[PDB]
Copies of this chain bind each other. A is one copy, B any other.
Amino acid sequence: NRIAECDIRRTGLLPEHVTAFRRQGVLVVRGLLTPQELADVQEAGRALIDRAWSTRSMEDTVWTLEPQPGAAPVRIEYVVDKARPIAMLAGHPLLLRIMEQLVGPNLIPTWDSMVFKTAWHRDAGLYDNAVGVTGAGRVIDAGIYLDPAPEDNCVWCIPESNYWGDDRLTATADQLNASAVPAVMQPGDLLLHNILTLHGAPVGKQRRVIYFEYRPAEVEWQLGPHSAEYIGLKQQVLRSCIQMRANEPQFGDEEPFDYQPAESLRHWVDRPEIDTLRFAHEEYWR
């Protein structure tokens, strides 16, 4: 059974899309980025990877082997704090109007990164009774694609596996890894998946995806995985990116996302106006 598709600039996010996402754990969104923004983010992506090779450092960068013959960077962490177009991407109103419907009005940006890879699994940050807490799709990985992902080389999902118990999840994944539907993507498209959805990929050309994860503040507040202070800082981060993007004249015609969480969840005055967009998870863990 196919992965539902939202042509976002054509229809908006329809109830059917929302329902598809909640049931199957995944949703394909076509044409998120305009031609111009796609190129801007492609370029920021290009420069960040180049700088990783030249500056063979592991600062916020995952390497296959130590910068050893055949070593390569495959991931940069906190890319929103590293490139101006990506920070502005983090405040994209179509993306965030979607995240608001799916995660709720108390959404906060958690992980942000860019993966450029050269196993079936769920993503991390699991809770006790994870399916009880977020089988419905409240903790969401936003994959914004800079390069094509053809059926040869794309992520595969097992729909509805976001409601699977631990035992069946583990048993099925072990079978699958020892020995499904594809998200076939064009640049500027967005893949949304529930972190509880079993996904994975099987000999191809380098691909780039920017990942934004989102959680409800009230889930973080009570269950983690971050510390309580973290909520307010990522709220400033979200508000800053929306601000930055709003003040950019190529985006002047966009109606900015109106971030309005419940009163008791507004925590951005709590701290002084932040210096950085980078907040290391290990420094804000519980």
Q: Which residues of A contact B (CB under 8 A)?
A: 13, 15, 18-19, 22-23, 97, 100-101, 104-106, 129, 131-133, 135-136, 138, 160, 162-165, 168, 216, 218-219, 221-223, 260-265
Interface of A (DSSP majority class): helix
Chain B residues whose C-beta falls within 8 Å of the C-beta of A222 in the assembled complex: 129, 131-132
The answer, among B18, B97, B104, B168, for a CB contact under 8 Å with A136, is B104
Alpha-carbon separation in the docked complex, A261 to B23 (Å) = 7
A180 to chain B, nearest CB (A): 14
A132 to chain B, nearest CB (A): 4
Q: Judge whether B133 and A18 touch: CB under 8 Å.
A: no
Q: How many copies does the complex hold?
A: 2
The answer, among B18, B105, B135, B165, for a CB contact under 8 Å with A22, is B105
Q: Whose C-beta in chain B lies nearest to the C-beta of A138?
A: B136
Q: Judge whether A164 and B132 touch: CB under 8 Å.
A: no
Q: Judge whether B136 and A216 touch: CB under 8 Å.
A: yes
Q: Judge whether B129 and A160 touch: CB under 8 Å.
A: no
The answer, among B101, B132, B264, for a CB contact under 8 Å with A218, is B132
The answer, among B23, B131, B219, B263, for a CB contact under 8 Å with A160, is B263
Could you list some 26 contacts between A and B, CB below 8 A? A13-B15, A19-B100, A19-B101, A19-B105, A22-B105, A104-B136, A106-B136, A106-B163, A129-B222, A131-B218, A131-B222, A132-B133, A132-B219, A132-B221, A132-B222, A133-B133, A135-B216, A135-B218, A135-B262, A136-B218, A160-B264, A162-B262, A163-B218, A163-B264, A163-B265, A165-B264
